[PDB]
Design a protein around this ligand. Sequence first.
Ligand SMILES: NC(=O)C1=CN([C@@H]2O[C@H](COP(=O)(O)OP(=O)(O)OC[C@H]3O[C@@H](n4cnc5c(N)ncnc54)[C@@H](OP(=O)(O)O)[C@@H]3O)[C@@H](O)[C@H]2O)C=CC1
Ligand SMILES: COc1ccc(OCCCCCC(=O)O)cc1Cc1cnc2nc(N)nc(N)c2c1C
Length: 206
Amino acid sequence: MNQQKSLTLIVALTTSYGIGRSNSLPWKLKKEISYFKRVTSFVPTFDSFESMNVVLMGRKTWESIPLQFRPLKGRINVVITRNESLDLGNGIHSAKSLDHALELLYRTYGSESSVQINRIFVIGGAQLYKAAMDHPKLDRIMATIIYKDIHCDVFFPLKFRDKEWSSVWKKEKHSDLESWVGTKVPHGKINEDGFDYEFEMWTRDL
Ligand SMILES: NC(=O)C1=CN([C@@H]2O[C@H](COP(=O)(O)OP(=O)(O)OC[C@H]3O[C@@H](n4cnc5c(N)ncnc54)[C@@H](OP(=O)(O)O)[C@@H]3O)[C@@H](O)[C@H]2O)C=CC1
Ligand SMILES: COc1ccc(OCCCCCC(=O)O)cc1Cc1cnc2nc(N)nc(N)c2c1C
């Protein structure tokens, strides 16, 4: 009991794979955040009685989210950290690795329990993404591609959209994205505050 679910990674990144600048996001993208929330939150209606999605995040990502938005509402939050928090203890799930998080969620949210887990998301940390790209249950990347070389100091660790990884990672038809995300989603370039981005969904075979 531990191999059940695929992991999905969700990320926004520039075409040079930049994702972060001063333990923050190098952009301010109200719509993009709104997609993140909607993807990360969606549970099919029949399952929305009992089921919640899970968001897994590195410790530096936890801190870098404005305090008023923590925990991410309507999703089971787990922060990955070797400490043995200390979190500020406080009823926010904690684990020292991606697999220790999964084990905790299965123990905590089992057949028995009131709440049921629907999908599991890795929402970041470059360090946590690195561990997720190595994990053999990671089969899906919901990527927002930012068409600008915004200066970054933290990078996505694997060039999954580049030719050297193109036999492993495959970009899906937009209708397959909408279908996976349960909603109609903007297709093509979107422009908030000065640059174009778009929503992509990438997969690999387990
Ligand atoms: N553009 C986007 O889509 C997103 C960008 N970001 C950005 O990425 C940056 C943060 O990335 P990064 O600095 O790497 O930090 P992370 O958010 O991955 O947090 C790093 C810390 O998380 C714990 N951790 C992460 N991975 C593991 C692991 N495999 N095993 C055990 N513990 C782990 C910490 O442990 P310990 O307690 O020991 O410190 C480690 O120091 C920020 O700028 C943030 O804004 C974040 C989310 C999304
Ligand atoms: C540094 O990470 C930040 C910094 C500030 C921030 O502003 C608060 C918004 C919270 C309200 C929405 C909700 O309730 O969900 C959010 C995040 C997380 C984030 C943002 N975009 C994201 N966009 C994508 N494509 N992927 C991610 N993984 C994102 C992730 C983790």
